[PDB]
Amino acid sequence: HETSYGEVVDRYWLNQYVLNRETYDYDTIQLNYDTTALLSTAAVQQEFYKIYEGEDARDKVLSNKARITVKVRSIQPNGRGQATVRFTTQQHDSTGAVGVKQHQIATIGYTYVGAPMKSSDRLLNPLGFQVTSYRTDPEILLNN
Amino acid sequence: HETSYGEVVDRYWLNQYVLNRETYDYDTIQLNYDTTALLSTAAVQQEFYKIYEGEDARDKVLSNKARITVKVRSIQPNGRGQATVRFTTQQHDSTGAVGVKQHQIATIGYTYVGAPMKSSDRLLNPLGFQVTSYRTDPEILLNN
Numbered sequence A, B: 001h002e003t004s005y006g007e008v009v010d011r012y013w014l015n016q017y018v019l020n021r022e023t024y025d026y027d028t029i030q031l032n033y034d035t036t037a038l039l040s041t042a043a044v045q046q047e048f049y050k051i052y053e054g055e056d057a058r059d060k061v062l063s064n065k066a067r068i069t070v071k072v073r074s075i076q077p078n079g080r081g082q083a084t085v086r087f088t089t090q091q092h093d094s095t096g097a098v099g100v101k102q103h104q105i106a107t108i109g110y111t112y113v114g115a116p117m118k119s120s121d122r123l124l125n126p127l128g129f130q131v132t133s134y135r136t137d138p139e140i141l142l143n144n
Helices: A007-022 A029-038 A042-052 A058-062 A119-124 B007-022 B029-038 B042-052 B058-062 B119-124
Strands: A066-077 A082-093 A102-112 A129-138 B066-077 B082-093 B102-112 B129-138
Touching: A007 A029, A007 A066, A007 A082, A007 A102, A007 A129, A007 B119, A029 A042, A029 A119, A042 A058, A042 A129, A119 B007, B007 B029, B007 B066, B007 B082, B007 B102, B007 B129, B029 B042, B029 B119, B042 B058, B042 B129
Parallel strands: none
Antiparallel strands: A066 A082, A082 A102, A102 A129, B066 B082, B082 B102, B102 B129
């Protein structure tokens, strides 16, 4: 139960993680941010929080004047606690300007630590899913 | 695996159901509505959809001019496929008018039907959680 809960359950949590972390939408940002934090180890929390700190904090810069919309294309767990997630992001400014679609890959380390101590956390993270490492990179696209 | 996945997992799904079904928030209604539909049997879907149909359709009436905020207080599964959920609702109009807090009980029948056929559904409902019956009633409050 620590390493994996099988492909379907691991994909559920990985999907929830990528969607909540990579989406930028003022309408849902409280939920997206809190979900991402809940599902991250302390070290990954600190990495994520920096996106929302400082002069370039994403919420300060985008405000309610742009959305970053995320489409997950595939999720491949290796069954050993790592996964890759292929996803696209695209920024839509409230003015109607649309950015170029970005093809990305998240490389994710994860584990399940057991039911959280606090009832409130346990209600939203029953198995103690925790992302232990997270990075994103451009996808390789070999055109023919 | 059909009747229950244990208290912690059943509470996760029951909580998600009540929050998504009973919350009214224009900012999250697409997600709330779709989640509720996904997690309901066809018969329960038809009951839920009626809230959003006709002249008194809740989205038509409240628009983006009010929110109904939900606080779940307790969730008691019986381990046999039924649960009660104690929750409060309170309407906040965008003007600042606030309604009286409503103390409610949801009586819920549920089951798990297995991984959905469609990949898209399976990513959001990995175990095939399905609400098979759902009603809400005022909570009994015996004051002393």
